[PDB]
Design a protein around this nucleic acid. Sequence first.
RNA 1: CUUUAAAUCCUUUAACGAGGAUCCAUUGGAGGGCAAGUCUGGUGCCAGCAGCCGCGGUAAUUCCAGCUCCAAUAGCGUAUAUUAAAGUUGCUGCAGUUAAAAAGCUCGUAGUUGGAUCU
Lengths: 218, 141, 180, 82, 30
Amino acid sequence: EWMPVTKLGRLVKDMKIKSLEEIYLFSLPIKESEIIDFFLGASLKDEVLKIMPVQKQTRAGQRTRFKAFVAIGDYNGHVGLGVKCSKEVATAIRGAIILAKLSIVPVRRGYWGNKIGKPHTVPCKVTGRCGSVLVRLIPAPRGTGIVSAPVPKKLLMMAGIDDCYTSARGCTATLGNFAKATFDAISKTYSYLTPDLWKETVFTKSPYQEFTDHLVKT
Amino acid sequence: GKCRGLRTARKLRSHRRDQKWHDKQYKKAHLGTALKANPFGGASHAKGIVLEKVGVEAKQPNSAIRKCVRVQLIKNGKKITAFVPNDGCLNFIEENDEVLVAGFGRKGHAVGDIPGVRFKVVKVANVSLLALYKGKKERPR
Amino acid sequence: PVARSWVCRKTYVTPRRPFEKSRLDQELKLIGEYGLRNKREVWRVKFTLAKIRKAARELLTLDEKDPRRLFEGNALLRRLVRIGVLDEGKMKLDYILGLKIEDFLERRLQTQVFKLGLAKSIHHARVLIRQRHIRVRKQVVNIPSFIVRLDSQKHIDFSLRSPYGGGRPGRVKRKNAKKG
Amino acid sequence: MQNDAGEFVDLYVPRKCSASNRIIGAKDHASIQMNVAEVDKVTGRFNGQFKTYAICGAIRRMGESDDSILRLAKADGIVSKN
Amino acid sequence: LGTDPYEDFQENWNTKHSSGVTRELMRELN
RNA sequence: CUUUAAAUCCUUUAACGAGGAUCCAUUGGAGGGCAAGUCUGGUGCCAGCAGCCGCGGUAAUUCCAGCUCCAAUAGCGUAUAUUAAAGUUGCUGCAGUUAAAAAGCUCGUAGUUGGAUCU
Ligand SMILES: [Mg+2]
């Protein structure tokens, strides 16, 4: 039973907000996982990328705690990645899934050459950076598949990308930084300005302003 | 930084020539001292005569006795130590036997616990050690 | 000096990673669905498609009215239409990149004789073809990888000299008939 | 953003900064969108209309979002000449 | 009612069988 | 019969020729890299395995075997030279504060590079 605590959840639960791109358009921080469960739900699938034991030295020996990396995606242009450390593996995974849901970003897809059909590749060459790891994504011809390492390929398939060349520099053996550098590159697709997006923006009322009267009485 | 002119090809090529010699693989291949010190002389296999049976104690933390053989090479008269691979395969070799010897997997480097041994036995008296070990062939009489 | 020719090719390429779990499941599914013998029979069709995609990608970088683009583009498109992989109404150089291995695997004689009802399965078709029971236009063919040209689809029949056509019974029925 | 058939194939169209013309992403939580009310020429009460400005987090971290909004309001006639 | 991969990994992540308990836990998760 | 200088082989054709230890598929593996058993018996830092990390000191997921399992397949292991991987020779395209590394400092010839400006 979803009892929302934020005013975005109280508008999602009341059918007022009827799309995730409506929340993405205004850059509002999403703090409840039931909002993501509301819109994507049956489309979402997750993947455990690694389980990392970490240790903290104490007077009476070590202190062990386990870290979990979880990727999530709907294979249709949404992808997220979450990491969580906890004393038990089951709790770590359960808590990392929530974070992965809360990190979900949209992905922009483009065309390599001629524009027939749905977009299939990245719109342009994009680079992601994370602690000595560099990941470069290059558009690829239709039907080539994902030419990449097994770690970024999972996140690239979660995001709906079909074709892409990849390059990687730095210590990629640390998959915690290798996965956070490809996630960073995917996030940049809706940050790169192209002549497609040169039109002046029309400003629509934010949901907080549009449903003021509903929020006051609820 | 590096020079970037249109008339720089000689500088770039000469610098690359000079700096390639600081690559140890390149120097080892192209200098010629590592070819004269190679007992096989550039060959993958060689034949030799067994002089003695030796036992080499393994490097720590392992504790065992790897069973090898001392072999004198026919084509140049050099002397090497060759490891006899499988379980009990030393019982098939006898002194004054002619054996076929190969590299031991790391292009002139020692492998594993066995210290200072770069070679392994393949055949004894024109019979492969695998056939003897699996009971396909026996030593000629 | 001899009057001999030394021209030959390899017709396949092995995968770079030998134990990729996703690729092992994907390839065995094709083997089982089309009744193939070994993994090398998937890497062959995949090599042929890879070379077709590579010629198209090279032609697509020329000018739209480049004389070589209009000559070798028409030839490739016509060749793909002739065997039945590409459609008649899709003769554009960008629709080659939409082709799949399953399209090429459907035009094998083994698949076709099964889909025409001559065989009861995809494994019965293999033995039927290899045992000299099938003919294409009065010619007996016993190569299961024979790619059926489109205007040959109608001329696949039982051989004229086989027990399943108008031929004599095989050795077994003849021998059992005299047993009594 | 659209194919050869003219269909729009973009999941959504992001906003752009009114100051630096930069795309405001989905995780730019330091970006603001501000409405400034419009008044009547005679009575000077809230007409019911407003003008909207979007400022990005990079510009308002830089300290230049105070001058940017003032410039944008001067351009629209809300602020007097000097 | 067999063995629990979670418990196996948590108890043998630093022993000789760590590489196997990781594989079994990954099989259970995915 | 055909082939061929004459033959052989392939192709074409009478006769004989297939049920289950056979008209019997092999080569390497099963801790990770890397697909696939903490199965059962033996050994006990020995014998041996192991490209690397490592296994073996009386309950060995790794040795020797049985069973089972999986990778390619009329082929599959090993040694060696070599290409890619190597953006670890870097023109594209690497580095030089602390990880390897800017000459003690300045002058100076060859070499390299060189500000507007004209229909
Ligand atoms: Mg495995």
